[PDB]
Scaffold this active site. Structure first.
Site, PDB file in Angstrom:
ATOM      1  N   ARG A  85       0.829  -1.195   0.000  1.00 54.86           N
ATOM      2  CA  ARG A  85       0.000   0.000   0.000  1.00 54.86           C
ATOM      3  C   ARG A  85       0.868   1.251   0.000  1.00 54.86           C
ATOM      4  NH1 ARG A  85      -1.859   0.937   4.293  1.00 54.86           N
ATOM      5  NH2 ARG A  85      -1.293  -0.861   5.591  1.00 54.86           N
ATOM      6  N   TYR A 233      -1.268  -4.257  -6.816  1.00 60.14           N
ATOM      7  CA  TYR A 233      -1.204  -4.882  -5.500  1.00 60.14           C
ATOM      8  C   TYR A 233      -2.584  -4.948  -4.856  1.00 60.14           C
ATOM      9  CZ  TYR A 233      -0.287  -5.349  -0.451  1.00 60.14           C
ATOM     10  OH  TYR A 233      -0.306  -5.742   0.870  1.00 60.14           O
ATOM     11  N   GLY A 234      -2.809  -6.024  -4.098  1.00 64.39           N
ATOM     12  CA  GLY A 234      -4.141  -6.313  -3.590  1.00 64.39           C
ATOM     13  C   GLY A 234      -4.733  -5.189  -2.762  1.00 64.39           C
ATOM     14  N   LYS A 242      -9.725  -2.990   1.770  1.00 56.85           N
ATOM     15  CA  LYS A 242      -9.393  -1.804   2.549  1.00 56.85           C
ATOM     16  C   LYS A 242     -10.214  -0.598   2.106  1.00 56.85           C
ATOM     17  CE  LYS A 242      -6.243  -4.059   4.826  1.00 56.85           C
ATOM     18  NZ  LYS A 242      -6.350  -4.292   6.301  1.00 56.85           N
ATOM     19  N   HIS A 262     -10.537  -2.704  11.806  1.00 62.80           N
ATOM     20  CA  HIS A 262      -9.399  -3.507  11.367  1.00 62.80           C
ATOM     21  C   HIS A 262      -9.111  -4.580  12.422  1.00 62.80           C
ATOM     22  CE1 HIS A 262      -4.940  -3.619   9.903  1.00 62.80           C
ATOM     23  NE2 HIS A 262      -5.661  -4.592   9.376  1.00 62.80           N
ATOM     24  N   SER A 284      -1.052  -3.436  10.845  1.00 65.28           N
ATOM     25  CA  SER A 284      -0.669  -4.328   9.761  1.00 65.28           C
ATOM     26  C   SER A 284       0.624  -5.060  10.103  1.00 65.28           C
ATOM     27  CB  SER A 284      -0.511  -3.541   8.460  1.00 65.28           C
ATOM     28  OG  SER A 284      -1.679  -2.788   8.168  1.00 65.28           O
ATOM     29  N   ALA A 285       0.661  -6.352   9.767  1.00 60.15           N
ATOM     30  CA  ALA A 285       1.811  -7.222  10.032  1.00 60.15           C
ATOM     31  C   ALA A 285       2.191  -7.206  11.512  1.00 60.15           C
ATOM     32  CB  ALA A 285       3.005  -6.846   9.152  1.00 60.15           C
ATOM     33  N   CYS A 286       1.175  -7.318  12.370  1.00 61.45           N
ATOM     34  CA  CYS A 286       1.377  -7.339  13.810  1.00 61.45           C
ATOM     35  C   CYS A 286       0.788  -8.571  14.482  1.00 61.45           C
ATOM     36  CB  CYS A 286       0.802  -6.067  14.447  1.00 61.45           C
ATOM     37  SG  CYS A 286       1.937  -4.651  14.375  1.00 61.45           S
ATOM     38  N   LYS A 288      -2.405 -10.491  13.543  1.00 65.46           N
ATOM     39  CA  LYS A 288      -3.828 -10.818  13.563  1.00 65.46           C
ATOM     40  C   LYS A 288      -4.087 -12.211  12.996  1.00 65.46           C
ATOM     41  CE  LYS A 288      -5.472  -7.232  11.400  1.00 65.46           C
ATOM     42  NZ  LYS A 288      -4.163  -6.538  11.224  1.00 65.46           N
ATOM     43  N   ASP A 309      -9.033  -9.959   9.589  1.00 68.56           N
ATOM     44  CA  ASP A 309      -8.583  -8.635   9.171  1.00 68.56           C
ATOM     45  C   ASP A 309      -9.638  -7.542   9.295  1.00 68.56           C
ATOM     46  OD1 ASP A 309      -6.319  -7.113   7.939  1.00 68.56           O
ATOM     47  OD2 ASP A 309      -7.850  -6.706   6.420  1.00 68.56           O
ATOM     48  N   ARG A 403       2.227 -12.125  -0.171  1.00 72.56           N
ATOM     49  CA  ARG A 403       0.935 -12.542   0.351  1.00 72.56           C
ATOM     50  C   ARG A 403       0.496 -13.849  -0.290  1.00 72.56           C
ATOM     51  NH1 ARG A 403      -1.653  -9.022   4.523  1.00 72.56           N
ATOM     52  NH2 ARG A 403      -0.239  -7.223   4.473  1.00 72.56           N
ATOM     53  N   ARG A 434       3.462  -3.552  18.331  1.00 74.06           N
ATOM     54  CA  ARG A 434       4.867  -3.892  18.547  1.00 74.06           C
ATOM     55  C   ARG A 434       5.500  -2.809  19.413  1.00 74.06           C
ATOM     56  NH1 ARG A 434       7.161  -7.804  14.696  1.00 74.06           N
ATOM     57  NH2 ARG A 434       5.433  -8.549  13.395  1.00 74.06           N
ATOM     58  N   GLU A 530       1.443 -20.030  22.328  1.00 78.10           N
ATOM     59  CA  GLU A 530       1.486 -19.760  23.758  1.00 78.10           C
ATOM     60  C   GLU A 530       0.600 -18.590  24.158  1.00 78.10           C
ATOM     61  OE1 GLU A 530       2.772 -21.947  25.509  1.00 78.10           O
ATOM     62  OE2 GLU A 530       4.297 -22.933  24.294  1.00 78.10           O
TER      63      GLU A 530
HETATM   64  N1  LIG Z   1       7.134 -12.470  18.131  1.00 80.84           N
HETATM   65  C1  LIG Z   1       5.958 -12.752  17.578  1.00 80.84           C
HETATM   66  N2  LIG Z   1       5.762 -12.492  16.238  1.00 80.84           N
HETATM   67  C2  LIG Z   1       4.573 -12.769  15.657  1.00 80.84           C
HETATM   68  C3  LIG Z   1       3.535 -13.315  16.400  1.00 80.84           C
HETATM   69  N3  LIG Z   1       2.479 -13.485  15.571  1.00 80.84           N
HETATM   70  C4  LIG Z   1       2.828 -13.060  14.335  1.00 80.84           C
HETATM   71  N4  LIG Z   1       4.124 -12.611  14.371  1.00 80.84           N
HETATM   72  C5  LIG Z   1       4.902 -12.066  13.240  1.00 80.84           C
HETATM   73  O1  LIG Z   1       4.236 -10.955  12.674  1.00 80.84           O
HETATM   74  C6  LIG Z   1       4.083 -11.084  11.274  1.00 80.84           C
HETATM   75  C7  LIG Z   1       2.688 -10.593  10.900  1.00 80.84           C
HETATM   76  O2  LIG Z   1       1.780 -11.672  10.899  1.00 80.84           O
HETATM   77  P1  LIG Z   1       0.234 -11.453  10.500  1.00 80.84           P
HETATM   78  O3  LIG Z   1      -0.704 -12.187  11.428  1.00 80.84           O
HETATM   79  O4  LIG Z   1       0.022 -11.909   9.070  1.00 80.84           O
HETATM   80  O5  LIG Z   1       0.028  -9.853  10.549  1.00 80.84           O
HETATM   81  P2  LIG Z   1      -1.436  -9.172  10.490  1.00 80.84           P
HETATM   82  O6  LIG Z   1      -1.787  -8.612  11.850  1.00 80.84           O
HETATM   83  O7  LIG Z   1      -2.471 -10.176  10.043  1.00 80.84           O
HETATM   84  O8  LIG Z   1      -1.270  -7.967   9.420  1.00 80.84           O
HETATM   85  P3  LIG Z   1      -2.170  -7.756   8.087  1.00 80.84           P
HETATM   86  O9  LIG Z   1      -2.512  -9.104   7.499  1.00 80.84           O
HETATM   87  O10 LIG Z   1      -1.371  -6.947   7.099  1.00 80.84           O
HETATM   88  O11 LIG Z   1      -3.439  -7.011   8.434  1.00 80.84           O
HETATM   89  C8  LIG Z   1       4.296 -12.553  10.946  1.00 80.84           C
HETATM   90  O12 LIG Z   1       5.087 -12.706   9.787  1.00 80.84           O
HETATM   91  C9  LIG Z   1       5.008 -13.130  12.154  1.00 80.84           C
HETATM   92  O13 LIG Z   1       6.363 -13.401  11.870  1.00 80.84           O
HETATM   93  C10 LIG Z   1       3.721 -13.583  17.751  1.00 80.84           C
HETATM   94  O14 LIG Z   1       2.810 -14.072  18.420  1.00 80.84           O
HETATM   95  N5  LIG Z   1       4.938 -13.296  18.334  1.00 80.84           N
HETATM   96  O1  LIG Z   2      -2.123  -3.770   5.169  1.00 83.94           O
HETATM   97  C1  LIG Z   2      -2.868  -4.592   5.684  1.00 83.94           C
HETATM   98  O2  LIG Z   2      -3.327  -4.527   6.904  1.00 83.94           O
HETATM   99  C2  LIG Z   2      -3.344  -5.827   4.886  1.00 83.94           C
HETATM  100  O3  LIG Z   2      -2.834  -5.921   3.687  1.00 83.94           O
HETATM  101  O4  LIG Z   2      -4.137  -6.620   5.377  1.00 83.94           O
HETATM  102 MN   LIG Z   3      -3.653 -10.768   8.050  1.00 82.60          MN
HETATM  103 MN   LIG Z   4      -4.957  -5.667   7.443  1.00 82.39          MN
END
Ligand SMILES: Nc1nc2c(ncn2[C@@H]2O[C@H](COP(=O)(O)OP(=O)(O)OP(=O)(O)O)[C@@H](O)[C@H]2O)c(=O)[nH]1
Ligand SMILES: O=C([O-])C(=O)[O-]
Ligand SMILES: [Mn+2]
Ligand SMILES: [Mn+2]
Ligand SMILES: [Mn+2]
Length: 620
Positions: A85, A233-234, A242, A262, A284-286, A288, A309, A403, A434, A530
């Site tokens: 994005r 891109y998606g 989104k 979200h 995002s990428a945290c 979920k 999501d 993705r 984070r 865990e």
């Molecule tokens: N240390 C740690 N890292 C994690 C954990 N869960 C996910 N991650 C990392 O965070 C990255 C994001 O994972 P996703 O679940 O796809 O992120 P998201 O929240 O779905 O983000 P979007 O799909 O973009 O909305 C992954 O590649 C993992 O490596 C966790 O419980 N602990």
């Molecule tokens: O950016 C984001 O949160 C996604 O692509 O899900």
């Molecule tokens: Mn996701």
């Molecule tokens: Mn998302």
């Protein structure tokens, strides 16, 4: 009806009929066909024959490759300039700027990007005229949420990208059945184009049609239109995700009295046969997707996935907060997905799955960083840049924002009520991001007003889903910073107004941090499966267990309240340490942020929570 019938594009329809479209749907297609000038018009029916023929066309055009190791899986490599994005090129058009973003004090808002209607018309007319020259315009009828459900909204997307059509078949409910349920009803107008009319002026890279220079994703909530240009891109091209289900839907939700967030939705069941549904908003990428389909480590617990999501939530007549997942698939991050971190995702992407910018193995499989699977002797890897890649190289074999696109029905732990039109009752809401320092593993909000404040004060490290680089702690309130459809101050007031509803069963609000690191740079909490230990404590707190200890930031679990069996090596002191010196700085940054970015639209209750938190910290 016409003097030359120049507005009659029926002769260019290769599938379907303009005579079978609703009135406002035909006007929408023919109007933009006249503007974009496509060589063909393809009205999608959602059938597997159409999907099959579409994939074959893309395979003949070199757009995608087939993954012969799996069942009906495909790989796409995009231009390296079109991988995520672009928040700086994502705009919202309203008559007044204050309706989209709060007028900041110091200046330059981070809560959205507003563009006037005059500027957008100049930008629109400099892109779309003749942009589909020589291409096929696909007509995509799709429904966000279960089809026929009165709480679902129907969209019509126009695109010249067969990659978009295939992805929308997975991510949404797409086909002729959506046009029949639509009828003469309203719909969100979605117009997308890669912006490379034929013949090509610029040389194409990796067969990926895109125009990074003219890239622009616009939203017009007053006109219920989504207009995106120059990206494949998606996040920029799958307009029902989104663009619609968050940005456009959040404004509609504010007007109609519901919520578009979200957030993942998971159902969790205890060994006592009792099930509850939780929602979690992470940036995002945290994490979920990993949390929404985690493999629990505690025996007797089961987690089922409703969504990962996007959540659409509304209080019902009984006072319960009902949520649905308006999507039909998972557009999840690929790197880090392994059998130990997300085995349920591994089982899902085994078939009928489209991957983007992941590495291909010589035996026809996929590969990415953190897959945690050794390869057989002789198996070589081709990176997402379509180059011979070796493990001892610097560049990763997969893009950090690569993705997979998989159907939600294939998930082994998909909740048996994920398509229920009445929704699932939410009993808890989770925030978090984070934070490498200061923020403890988990705590519980003192009230609904404090909980809303906790969401507003969210901060997290930057990820690869947008254009923000580096390890800098940014604000991301409610994990919605890139997705606010309207004024964030009014968004806060809308959340606070839920406490004024009659007999409203307000959910509990928690804040988690999986990413607290020690002085050596390694995580204090193992995470992934865990995290069921953390969910167990939330479950008990919802039932009213006396397991909480009051702190200046909220309720934390008592001593020995968490189940740490098997993880005796966890340092609990630093994991739940609440330093007065850290939180004095934290309230300072949150105060300066809210005062600047929200300014005159900050609800007093959010200001009162900031004042109350700063007072409790000063007494430490
Ligand atoms: N240390 C740690 N890292 C994690 C954990 N869960 C996910 N991650 C990392 O965070 C990255 C994001 O994972 P996703 O679940 O796809 O992120 P998201 O929240 O779905 O983000 P979007 O799909 O973009 O909305 C992954 O590649 C993992 O490596 C966790 O419980 N602990
Ligand atoms: O950016 C984001 O949160 C996604 O692509 O899900
Ligand atoms: Mn996701
Ligand atoms: Mn998302
Ligand atoms: Mn109030």
């Amino acid at each position: 009806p016409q003097l030359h019938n120049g507005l009659d594009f029926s002769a260019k329809v290769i599938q379907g009929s303009l005579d079978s479209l609703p009135q406002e749907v035909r006007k929408f297609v023919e109007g933009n066909a006249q503007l974009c000038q496509p060589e063909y018009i393809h009205i999608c029916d959602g059938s597997e024959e159409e999907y099959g023929r579409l994939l074959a066309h893309m395979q003949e055009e070199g757009v995608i490759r087939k993954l012969k190791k799996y069942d009906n899986c495909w790989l796409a490599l995009t231009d390296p300039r079109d991988v995520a994005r672009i928040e700086s090129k994502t705009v919202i058009i309203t008559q007044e700027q204050r309706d989209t973003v709060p007028i900041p004090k110091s200046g330059q808002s981070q809560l959205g990007r507003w563009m006037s209607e005059e500027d957008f018309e100049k930008a629109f007319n400099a892109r779309f005229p003749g942009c589909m020259k020589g291409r096929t315009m696909y007509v995509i009828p799709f429904s966000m949420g279960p089809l026929g459900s009165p709480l679902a909204k129907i969209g019509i997307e126009l695109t010249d990208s067969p990659y978009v059509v295939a992805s929308m078949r997975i991510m949404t409910r797409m086909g002729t059945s959506v046009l029949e349920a639509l009828g003469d009803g309203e719909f969100i107008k979605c117009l997308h184009s890669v912006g490379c009319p034929l013949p090509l002026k610029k040389p194409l890279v990796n067969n990926w049609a895109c125009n990074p220079e003219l890239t622009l994703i616009a939203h017009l909530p007053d006109r219920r239109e989504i207009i995106s240009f120059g990206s494949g891109y998606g996040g920029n091209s799958l307009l029902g995700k989104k663009c619609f289900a968050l940005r456009i839907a959040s404004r509609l939700a504010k007007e109609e009295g519901w919520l578009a967030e979200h957030m993942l939705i998971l159902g969790i069941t205890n060994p006592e046969g009792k099930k509850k549904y939780l929602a979690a908003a992470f940036p995002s990428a945290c994490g979920k997707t990993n949390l929404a389909m985690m493999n629990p480590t505690l025996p007797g617990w089961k987690v089922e996935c409703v969504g990962d999501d996007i959540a659409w939530m509304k209080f019902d007549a009984q006072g319960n907060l009902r949520a649905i997942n308006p999507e039909n698939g998972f557009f999840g991050v690929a790197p880090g997905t392994s059998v130990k971190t997300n085995p349920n995702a591994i089982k899902t992407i085994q078939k009928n799955t489209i991957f983007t910018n992941v590495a291909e193995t010589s035996d026809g499989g996929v590969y990415w960083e953190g897959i945690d699977e050794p390869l057989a002797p002789g198996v070589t890897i081709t990176s997402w840049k379509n180059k011979e890649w070796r493990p001892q190289d610097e560049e990763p074999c997969a893009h950090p924002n690569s993705r997979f696109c998989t159907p939600a029905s294939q998930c082994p732990i998909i909740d048996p009520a994920w398509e229920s039109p009445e929704g699932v009752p939410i009993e808890g809401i989770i925030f978090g991001g984070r934070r490498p320092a200061g923020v403890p593993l988990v705590y519980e909000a003192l009230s609904w007003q404090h909980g809303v404040f906790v969401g507003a004060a969210m901060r997290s490290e930057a990820t690869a889903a947008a254009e923000h680089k580096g390890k800098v702690i940014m604000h991301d309130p409610f994990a919605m910073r890139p997705f606010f459809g309207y004024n964030f101050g009014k968004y806060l007031a809308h959340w606070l107004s839920m406490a004024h509803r009659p007999a409203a069963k307000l959910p509990k609000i928690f804040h988690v941090n999986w990413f607290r690191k020690d002085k050596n740079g390694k995580f204090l909490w193992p995470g992934f499966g865990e995290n069921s230990r953390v969910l167990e404590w939330m479950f008990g707190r919802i039932e009213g267990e006396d397991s909480a200890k009051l702190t200046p930031i909220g309720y934390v679990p008592k001593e020995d309240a968490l189940n740490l069996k098997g993880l005796g090596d966890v340092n609990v002191e630093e994991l739940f340490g609440i330093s007065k010196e850290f939180w004095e700085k934290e309230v300072e940054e949150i105060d300066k942020y809210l005062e600047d970015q929200v300014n005159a639209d900050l609800p007093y209750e959010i200001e009162r929570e900031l004042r109350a938190l700063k007072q409790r910290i000063s007494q430490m």
